[PDB]
Design a protein around this ligand. Structure first.
Ligand SMILES: Nc1ncnc2c1ncn2[C@@H]1O[C@H](COP(=O)(O)OP(=O)(O)OP(=O)(O)O)[C@@H](O)[C@H]1O
Ligand SMILES: [Cl-]
Ligand SMILES: [Mg+2]
Length: 493
């Protein structure tokens, strides 16, 4: 189940020890009470047991419920919400709202009703209620948790029990957090090998990006430490492995996906792309081999070592990186580029899910890289009849050789791409919240042995200590909640 010796080191400290922390933390409302899972829970208990804020809590909860409920149910839920909180003679009536918002909220509909009302409620909650919360026993308890979150939790706390895969710098293991029982993947990078092959920069960029981005469509970093021989990244476990295995290696006679399945994965990859592009990051390594699948049947993107973060007032970059057959014409030509290259590789990826072969070579054909580059620059793609009219069109709109014409990310978003007929039966709102059932669930399917193969300077040592930054806060708080430890220790008397 879990190790009693490591479970017994999760205990709340006496308050005296939490003094210093006050200075080191952001005590802003958005950052503490909305973005940190344990902060939100505690804030919500305060609002629940101080009953004058009761009307504001239940309106908050009923908006989130409306936002993620499915189409047929929404019309009735809107009517309920209006009546409960927005009629003057109602019991849970929200006086604190201003006359305009109150008025505007009681009329019409749309794909985002009550988004202005949700801002008005958070705006209110950030003033008096928040101020009183800081004077309460619940804020003090927040500090106890943030202290425990900061204690050292390195190599000794994880048990490796099986090999999941092999990368360029070492193995990736399935492992267990000893105190809570939770399962993760741990990717190992050999230090001596990283040095001789000049891979520091690629390793650091991947770790920086996986720490700061928080999306259900990209693998999440929970811990980063060092051992005497390796650097380690502990991250979301994806037990189904890569999407490419599933195209070719399961049904040999009849490879490829049915169309509804191919569309669903396409929609999840677009959301992850969007979360990268909103932060000015270019991925540069999208392919079936790097899209992974979990026990429930959802996917995420991985392998971020080829990525580039655009600096202040830079809109394009140069550089020859990627996998032949996935690199767009503008890149092959030596031009400057932006997000365009990611949307071409998305075209190649959908094509292969449906057809079980690439658009520029027959299945099991052998082509030297120089010939494959000429094909991408000049060849028209042909489409066999496994494609519908909609999926043919969508692929043509991404594989388009002129990036000025290609569909993708513009004016802050992928909302133009989302309206394509291909997606007509997909509920974007529900997909983004994690509440569609995937139309395939992983059935019965769950590594050959090989052997293994200069002192360091302070430059190397100091680089290793900077890489090994410790525990990421949002994922740690989730672990504590999911596994039941929050429930057992968050008690008073
Ligand atoms: N989060 C994960 N969950 C489960 N398995 C994983 C996970 N991450 C990686 N793996 C397995 O380990 C293999 C190598 O991982 P990864 O792509 O991160 O290596 P890499 O050395 O960065 O690859 P490349 O040299 O292609 O950039 C993957 O193909 C996959 O099978
Ligand atoms: Cl299928
Ligand atoms: Mg890599």
């Amino acid at each position: 189940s879990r190790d009693r010796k490591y479970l017994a080191r999760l205990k709340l400290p006496p308050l005296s020890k939490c003094e210093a922390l006050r200075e080191s933390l952001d005590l802003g409302f958005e950052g503490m009470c909305l973005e940190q899972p344990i902060g939100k829970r505690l804030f919500q208990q305060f609002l629940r047991t101080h009953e004058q804020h009761g009307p504001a809590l239940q309106l908050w909860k009923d908006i989130e419920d409306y936002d993620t409920a499915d189409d047929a149910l929404r019309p009735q839920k809107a009517q309920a919400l209006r009546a409960a909180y927005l009629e003057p003679q109602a019991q849970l009536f929200c006086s604190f709202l201003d006359a305009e918002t109150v008025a505007r909220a009681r009329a019409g509909a749309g794909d985002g009703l009550f988004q202005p009302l949700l801002r008005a409620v958070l705006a209110h909650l950030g003033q008096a209620p928040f101020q009183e919360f800081l004077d309460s026993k619940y804020f003090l308890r927040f500090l106890q948790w943030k202290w425990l979150e900061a204690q050292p939790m390195g190599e000794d706390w994880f048990l490796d029990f099986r090999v999941l895969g092999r990368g360029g710098f070492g193995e990736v293991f399935a492992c267990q957090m000893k105190a809570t029982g939770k399962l993760y993947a741990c990717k190992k990078l050999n230090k001596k090998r990283l040095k001789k092959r000049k891979g520091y920069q690629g390793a650091m960029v991947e770790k920086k990006i996986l720490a700061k981005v928080h999306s259900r469509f990209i693998v999440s970093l929970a811990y980063a430490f060092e051992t005497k021989t390796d650097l380690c990244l502990v991250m979301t476990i994806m037990n189904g492995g890569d999407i490419r295995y599933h195209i070719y290696n399961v049904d040999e006679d009849n490879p490829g996906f049915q169309e509804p399945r191919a569309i669903f994965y396409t929609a999840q990859i677009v959301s992850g792309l969007e979360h990268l592009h909103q932060r000015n990051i270019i991925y540069r390594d999208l392919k079936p081999e790097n899209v992974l699948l979990d026990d429930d049947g959802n996917v995420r993107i991985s392998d971020l070592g080829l990525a580039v973060e655009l600096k202040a007032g830079q809109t394009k970059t140069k550089g020859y990186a990627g996998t032949p057959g996935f690199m767009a014409p503008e890149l092959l030509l030596g031009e400057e580029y932006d997000f365009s290259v990611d949307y071409f590789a998305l075209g190649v990826t959908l094509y292969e899910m449906i057809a079980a072969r690439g658009p520029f070579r027959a299945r099991g054909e052998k082509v030297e890289n120089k010939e494959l580059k000429q094909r991408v620059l000049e060849q028209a793609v042909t489409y066999p009849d496994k494609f519908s009219p909609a999926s043919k069109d969508f692929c043509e709109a991404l594989l388009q050789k002129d990036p000025e014409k290609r569909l993708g990310f513009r004016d802050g978003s992928c909302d133009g791409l989302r309206t394509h007929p291909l997606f007509r039966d997909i509920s974007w709102r529900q997909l983004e919240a994690g509440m569609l059932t995937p139309p395939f669930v992983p059935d019965s399917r769950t590594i050959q042995d090989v052997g293994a193969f200069v002192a360091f300077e302070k430059a190397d040592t100091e680089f290793f200590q900077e890489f090994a930054s410790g525990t990421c806060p949002i994922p740690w708080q989730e672990e504590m909640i999911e596994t039941g430890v929050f429930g057992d220790l968050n008690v008073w008397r």
